[PDB]
Amino acid sequence: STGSATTTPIDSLDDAYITPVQIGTPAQTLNLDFDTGSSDLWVFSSETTASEVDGQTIYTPSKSTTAKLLSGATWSISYGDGSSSSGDVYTDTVSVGGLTVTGQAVESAKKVSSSFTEDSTIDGLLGLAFSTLNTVSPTQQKTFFDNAKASLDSPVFTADLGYHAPGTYNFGFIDTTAYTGSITYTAVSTKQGFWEWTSTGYAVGSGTFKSTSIDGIADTGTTLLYLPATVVSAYWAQVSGAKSSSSVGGYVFPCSATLPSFTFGVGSARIVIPGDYIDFGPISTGSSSCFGGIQSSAGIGINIFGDVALKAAFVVFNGATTPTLGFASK
Numbered sequence: 001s002t003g004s005a006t007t008t009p010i011d012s013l014d015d016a017y018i019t020p021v022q023i024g025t026p027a028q029t030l031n032l033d034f035d036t037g038s039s040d041l042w043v044f045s046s047e048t049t050a051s052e053v054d055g056q057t058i059y060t061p062s063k064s065t066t067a068k069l070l071s072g073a074t075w076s077i078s079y080g081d082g083s084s085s086s087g088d089v090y091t092d093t094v095s096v097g098g099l100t101v102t103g104q105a106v107e108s109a110k111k112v113s114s115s116f117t118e119d120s121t122i123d124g125l126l127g128l129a130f131s132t133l134n135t136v137s138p139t140q141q142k143t144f145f146d147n148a149k150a151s152l153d154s155p156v157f158t159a160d161l162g163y164h165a166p167g168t169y170n171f172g173f174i175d176t177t178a179y180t181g182s183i184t185y186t187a188v189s190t191k192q193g194f195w196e197w198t199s200t201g202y203a204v205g206s207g208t209f210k211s212t213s214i215d216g217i218a219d220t221g222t223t224l225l226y227l228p229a230t231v232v233s234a235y236w237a238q239v240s241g242a243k244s245s246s247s248v249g250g251y252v253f254p255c256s257a258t259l260p261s262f263t264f265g266v267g268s269a270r271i272v273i274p275g276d277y278i279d280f281g282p283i284s285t286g287s288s289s290c291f292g293g294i295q296s297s298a299g300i301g302i303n304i305f306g307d308v309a310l311k312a313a314f315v316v317f318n319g320a321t322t323p324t325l326g327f328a329s330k
Contacts, residue, residue: 001099001100001148001151001152001153001172002098002099002152002153002170002171002172002173003095003096003097003098003099003148003170003171003172004097004098004168004169004170004171005019005020005021005096005097005168005169006019006020006166006167006168007019007034007161007162007166007167007168007169008166009162009164009165009166010119010121010122011121012164012281013280013281014161014162014163014164014223014307014311015223016033016119016122016221016223016307017033017034017161017167017220017307018031018032018033018121018122018123019031019032019033019034019096019126019169020032021094021095021096021126022093022094022095022096023043023059023064023092023093023094023106024059024061024063024064024065024066024067024092024093025064025065025066025092025093026064027095028057028059028060028063028064029057030043030044030057030058030059030123030124031057031121031122031123032122032123032124032125032126033122033124033125033126033221034125034126034128034159034169034220034221035125035126035127035128035129035219035220035221036128036129036159036194036195036217036218036219036220036221036317037080037127037129037194037195037217037219037220037221037222037304038077038079038125038127038129038133038221039127039128039129039130039131039132039133039134039135039143039193040075040077040107040125040127040133040134040135040136041094041104041105041106041107041124041125041126041127041143041144042075042077042085042087042106042107042108042109042124042125043058043059043106043107043108043109043123043124044056044057044058044059044109044112044116044123044124045058045059045060045061045087045108045109046058046059046060046061046062047087047088047108047109047110048087048108048109048110048111048112049110049111049112052111052112052116052117053117054117054118054120055120056120056122056123057123058123059106059108059123059124061090061092061106061108064092066092066093066102067090067091067092067106068090068091068092069088069089069090070088070089070090070091070105070136070139070141072138073088073089073105073136073137073138073139073141074086074087074088074089074136074137075087075088075089075107075135075136075137076135077135079221080222080300080304081115082113082115083113083114083115083116084112084113085109085111085112085113085116086109086110086111087107087108087109087110087111088107088108088110089105089106089107089108089136089141090105090106090108091103091104091105091106092104092106094106094144096126096144096169096171097169097170097171099148099152099171099172101144101147101148103147104144104147105134105136105141105142107136107141109124125221126144127143127144128143128144128145128157128220128317129143129193129194129195130143130190130193130194131143131146132190132193133193133194145157145171145317145319146319148171148172149319152171152172153172153173154172154173154174155172155318155319155320156171156172156173156174156316156317156318156319156320157169157170157171157172157317157319158170158174158175158178158314158315158316158317159220159310159314159315159317160175160178160179160314160315160330161220161307161310161311162311163274163276163277163311163312167311174316178314178330179313179314179328179329179330180328180329180330181328181329182269182328183314183316183326183327183328184266184267184268184269184326184327184328185267185316185318185324185325185326186198186266186267186324186325186326186327187324188318188323188324188325190323192217192302194217194218194219194302195217195218195219195317195323195325196215196216196217197215197216197217197218197325198213198214198215198216199213199214199215199216199264199265199266199305200212200213200214200265200266200267200268201213201214201264201265202214202227202231202262202263202264202265203262203263203270204234204235204238204260204261204262204263205238205260205261205262205275206260207238209263209265209270210234211265214227214228214231214264214303215302215303216297216302216303216304216305217302217303217304217305218305218310218315218317218325219304219305219306219310220306220307220310221306222304222306222307223280223293223306223307223308224280224293224294224295224304224306224307224308225262225273225278225293225294225295225304225305225306225308225309226295226296226297226300226302226303226304226306227294227295227296227297227303228296228297228298228303229296229297229298232251232294232295232296235260235262235294236251236253236292236294238260239253239254239257239259239260240254240257241253241254241257242254242257242292244296245289248283248289248291250291250292250295250296251291251292251294251295251296252283252289252290252291252292253289253290253292254288254289254290255281255282255287255288255289255290256288257290258275259275259276259278259279260275261273261274261275262275262278262294264305264309266327269327271309271312271313271327271329272312272329273308273309273312274312277293277308277311277312278292278293278294278308279292279293280292280293293308294308312329313327313328313329313330314327314328314329314330315327316328
């Protein structure tokens with residue numbers, strides 16, 4: 001089997017991407033944030049605290065003939081940005097882009113933090129990291145990809161995120177028309193439950209490439225590119241007037257600037273992030289100070305190849321017995 005679904009930016013900055021997901025019978029379609037940095041499929045639901053729902057579409061298990069309470073199971077998750085959610089668990093039929101999993105754990109939110117409530121466009125998350133990170137207790141549950149894997153034509157999914165445009169998540173096949181040149185594959189460590197890999201270095205604009213190992217995670221659920229302070233300083237030093245602002249919470253730059261590109265290494269291959277992808281616009285409405293899309297990972301504890309980086313590539317998440325990651329230009 002295979003599946004193919006379009007993923008769409010939630011706003012003009014590509015702050016996140018939503019992908020329609022069919023849950024239950026008859027289908028209830030919710031728009032979920034596919035997150036390769038976590039491993040819970042959770043949804044706004046009929047059980048969510050009413051005051052914490054503001055415009056989201058909810059899953060109502062009582063209206064699904066295939067929903068079953070997973071008795072005794074609870075979940076609770078906290079994300080790197082400080083947001084969180086928790087609740088109980090149903091199993092139900094879940095389909096993405098024509099690919100169907102029966103008996104998928106659908107985690108129903110009883111509580112969500114303010115950032116979720118305030119984002120009316122995201123109806124939940126669909127985790128695509130390794131199932132060892134799944135938070136369901138006392139019986140850990142599998143991700144949608146893990147459940148689907150054995151049925152897939154090939155045990156892979158791909159992320160093809162757009163810049164200010166829709167893109168695609170495919171399951172079970174590699175679309176050879178979706179990228180240019182060849183795909184370069186690189187080793188993954190699953191020790192922390194992430195799609196963790198080591199970049200071979202970087203360049204700033206037309207500058208020379210610096211060979212240096214940068215361990216980090218491929219994370220579709222993180223907006224920006226978070227790299228070591230040395231790397232980030234070298235990037236922003238090439239933008240007149242750019243500075244790190246503790247009051248704003250990162251690097252800012254004059255909105256009048258033309259940003260240089262940023263290149264990262266994948267083995268002997270190179271992925272180029274155009275300067276425009278690094279512009280996240282005014283820090284507040286009408287400001288001439290703009291927020292940067294490359295930020296320091298210092299104090300996160302891990303480097304994160306978020307959407308800024310991933311959207312410059314066609315990315316293969318290879319879930320074979322020994323997982324690997326592939327990157328191509330596009």
